[PDB]
């Protein structure tokens, strides 16, 4: 009875993975499917063990796996091939559950060559591999759903939406294609309340976008002093360089912000750092007509 | 339960013999709508007998199949209709439309006889079923010739 | 080119499944001329799906076959028509001529299901096709019983 | 010597799972056992490699796996069979570690047919599969232990107990048998402080119990405006339907809350929605004798 045991040990193994992705996936419909699958993995094992005497894999079991597999391919839409696994934790656990499910097919395809196995066993096995894959896809579509609202709510100053989004798992470090993160948008607009709640959840305090800007750059550029302090208290790079090479001191010296120049210099800004234009913070202060900033940089030596 | 019904996914002599018999009884149900009242009742009884044979074969002999009385009934019909068929040396299949249906049924009955014979060789169950199928192919042949003769005789009256 | 056409001279599981499906679609084409307008359209969609399954099987899985939407479509028809058939313990096959045609189609669909199952065992291609064929035999059975019911109801 | 290699690769594989469930299981005694198992999985590998020359799996090793396996089966009581795996993460990681442990038995049972392997290897292996199962059971018993305490503390208004519970892993979305969650109990009673920390952990803002009530329903039913405000700020369903089908506006109009009817209407309450008795918010305001609510809904 050697081949049927390895299947039982893989059915039992897959059930451990399915139960794991169940406790991770934060959506109700995915967990409903996964729990039915778990209770069906009992029947599927009982089918292989008894050879058809006890409980058997019914066609209504396979049919339900397809009913949901069609309902999910509608929300997904076009399914790109050659996609890398491990999108998000709820999705990634489902990807691993899928890979084990496909191994159970390989264990079933072997054992069927050594003992008659009801065809519905491999049919449900093949449908389980498919429906687990739709589970992971939907999980990532909804993770990108929340993250596109967190970047939106961080822009519109939605102190309450950002709360509901970060409480529902919206990735606080969600990076746009521009490289802009919700922490970037909060410092840009100037909603100090969101800057803290983002950093509390574990925001990347010095994320770089395409331009190379950090949240401290945007906070110094747009005259939001309150954000410059809390960013620097959290270890923001005070002399970070964007593509142009300008530091927060350069940008704070350009736009005529003395109280921000004073704070950035206090945590260790470089008066001698030069952008790619050779101009120092002492230069960009003189270039823009801001005098009281240049002397703070001049007397800083 | 509705989505599932009954599903068969293997090739073994029992499954092949029952499928051919299912094909045979389905074709008889089609062909019984082209014959007269007398032949229709005969063909329906044959369908019931095929169900008994399938019950025996599908149960691997645990369920009782046809009885020897059914085989005697087929033999009496063959004896009764052989007198009417003044022996014809050769006749092209499908002399009439109704005769063509019966010839198709006879070929399926012959194939079913071969499949059930394979089952009997493999398991030793189904001797009476094989005898019934042999007599059934002979009887189906006789009925086609009788239909041709009776339809031809009415054609000679209209001229 | 005319004299030649298409010639098949080998016996393998792939060839047998496609040939039986050709028989199934030919018999469905015969039977669709005996049913009403609704059932005729249902049988024609089934014929296209049988053609898709043959395309998948004949290409050894390189060409995409039926989709899960087609299987859901069969299931909805089975669910819709199972409600109408108040369960009858047994009825002899071929209650009417149209019902007899559908019973012939059902037997060929069951045999084709067996052949396609052989292909799935041998090559691992045709899982969705096998599911469609199982549901198709059930639907053909249900349609035959419904035809019987309608002729009996007009007799009442 | 090819089969003894596959066992080593599975011992090493199980050790990865054991160390993972160790860093997950938040109790000291479970981690205590798991750490010995890891250090013992080394010896178990060295036993299979050396065939008994170097370190060997001792009976005292198997003996300790049973001493702890009895101490845990006592706290559990009756262990129902055919129970679905993956209860909670600490348990689920242990369930997967168990499934790998049982695979190591199959790799050992194979290799033992090809090279002499000390019986204590499979004995410790078989006992390891069992003791990991008790770990998962205990993890869920203690996870369900906190969840009945979080549901309990949310009832009594224990602002301090909820702090220790949510910090120690008590599931904020823990559903009682009634279908009631701690957010339901906090809005029901009216302990506003707990409502905040619960939603902060990620409470299901519109979970439905058996009756179909949502946290916004219970908050509107018992006249806690402060709780109705914060629920709606998080996107609570302002026209949610229970088994009765009454929306929050229905319930707020039934029990005489003008300031809640007005605020629910600002976020999109339905003046004309009907319950299963056909009575609308204009009806139920008249039915219970509240007139100033009926006029605001009539002018809507
Ligand atoms: Ca044929």
Author numbering:
A (entry chain D): 22 to 322
B (entry chain B): 14 to 172
C (entry chain C): 14 to 169
D (entry chain F): 22 to 321
The study reports:
The helical N-termini of the evolved anti-BARD1 DARPins were genetically fused to the helical C-terminus of the B subunit of a two-component tetrahedral protein nanocage using recently described stabilizing ‘staple’ mutations at the subunit B trimer interface; subunit A of the tetrahedral assembly is invariant and is the same for all designs. No crystals were found in the crystallization screens for the apo DARP3 assembly; however, crystals in space group I222 that diffracted to 3.81 Å resolution were identified in one condition in the screens of the BARD1–DARP3 assembly. The structure was solved by molecular replacement using a single component of the cage (subunit B) and an isolated DARPin molecule as search models. There was no electron density for the BARD1 cargo protein, indicating that we had crystallized and solved the structure of the apo state of our scaffold. The most likely explanation for ligand dissociation is the composition of the crystallization solution, which has a low pH (0.07 M sodium acetate pH 4.6) and contains a not insignificant concentration of a nonpolar solution (14% 2-propanol) which may interfere with protein–protein interactions and/or protein solubility. The DARP3 assembly crystals have a very high solvent content of 71.47% and a Matthews coefficient of 4.31 Å3 Da−1. As a result, the lattice has large solvent-filled channels with an approximate cross section of 120 × 180 Å that are periodically restricted by the protrusion of the DARPin moiety of chain E into the solvent channel. The DARPin moieties of chains D and F are involved in mediating crystal contacts in the crystal lattice and thus are unavailable for cargo binding. The substrate-binding face of the chain E DARPin is oriented such that substrate binding is possible without creating steric clashes with other components of the lattice.
Imaging scaffolds composed of designed protein cages fused to designed ankyrin repeat proteins (DARPins) have enabled the structure determination of small proteins by cryogenic electron microscopy (cryo-EM). One particularly well characterized scaffold type is a symmetric tetrahedral assembly composed of 24 subunits, 12 A and 12 B, which has three cargo-binding DARPins positioned on each vertex. A total of three subunit B-DARPin fusion constructs were made. Together, both components co-assemble into a discrete particle that obeys tetrahedral symmetry and contains 12 copies of the DARPin-fusion subunit and 12 copies of the nonfusion component (four sets of each trimeric protein). As part of a project targeting oncogenic protein targets, we generated DARPins against the C-terminal domain of the oncogenic protein BARD1 using a yeast display system and subsequently fused the anti-BARD1 DARPins to a previously characterized tetrahedral protein cage.
